[PDB]
From a paper:
“Self” lysozyme protein (mHEL3X) was expressed on the surface of all mouse cells under control of the ubiquitin gene promoter. Superposition of the structures revealed the backbone of the self and foreign antigens to be extremely similar (rmsd of 0.29 Å for 94 Cα atoms) with differences primarily restricted to surface side chains. In response to self-lysozyme-SRBC a very different antibody VH-domain mutation, S52R, was carried by 60% of Hy10 GC cells, including 30% where S52R was paired with Y53F. Bio-layer interferometry revealed that the S52R mutation, alone or in combination with the Y53F mutation, abolished measurable binding to the highest concentration of self-lysozyme tested, representing at least 100-fold lower affinity. Thus, when foreign SRBCs displayed a protein structurally identical to self, the Hy10 trajectory adopted was mutation away from self-recognition. Following HEL3X self-lysozyme-SRBC without self-reactivity, few Hy10 GC cells followed the affinity-lowering S52R mutation trajectory. Instead almost all had acquired VH mutations Y53D (84% of cells), Y58F (10%), or both, that increase affinity for HEL3X (self-lysozyme).
Author numbering: 1 to 129
Write the structure that this text describes.
Amino acid sequence: KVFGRCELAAAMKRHGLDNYQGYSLGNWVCAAKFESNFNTQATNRNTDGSTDYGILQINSRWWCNDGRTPGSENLCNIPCSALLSSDITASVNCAKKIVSRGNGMNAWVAWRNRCKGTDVQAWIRGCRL
Ligand SMILES: [Cl-]
Ligand SMILES: [Cl-]
Ligand SMILES: [Cl-]
Ligand SMILES: [Cl-]
Ligand code: NA
């Protein structure tokens, strides 16, 4: 599913990401824009042999099981394919664990490099939330 911007904002708010670990909703929408272009089906292979999955490009080494990432932890206890669903619940639950870990949203390199320090509230402008 390719979410609309306000559609994704509403879903992330409903699932409790607005202000989660102090990160306002626009941070999460901006992260999703640059990680996945709002596409739940996005996948991208990393140089270490892991793969990133879903709207927030969650990685198979630490977080989800894809059956092909040797030495993988599955700290979210899900199959990585759960992260490609039109239902963002599994991505949100796993993102909450990731962002709680100690480096916060710096875990998402697209967030560091294209959202951090910017006017992220622009990403929820116009939305009825
Ligand atoms: Cl929308
Ligand atoms: Cl957009
Ligand atoms: Cl915001
Ligand atoms: Cl959803
Ligand atoms: Na894994």
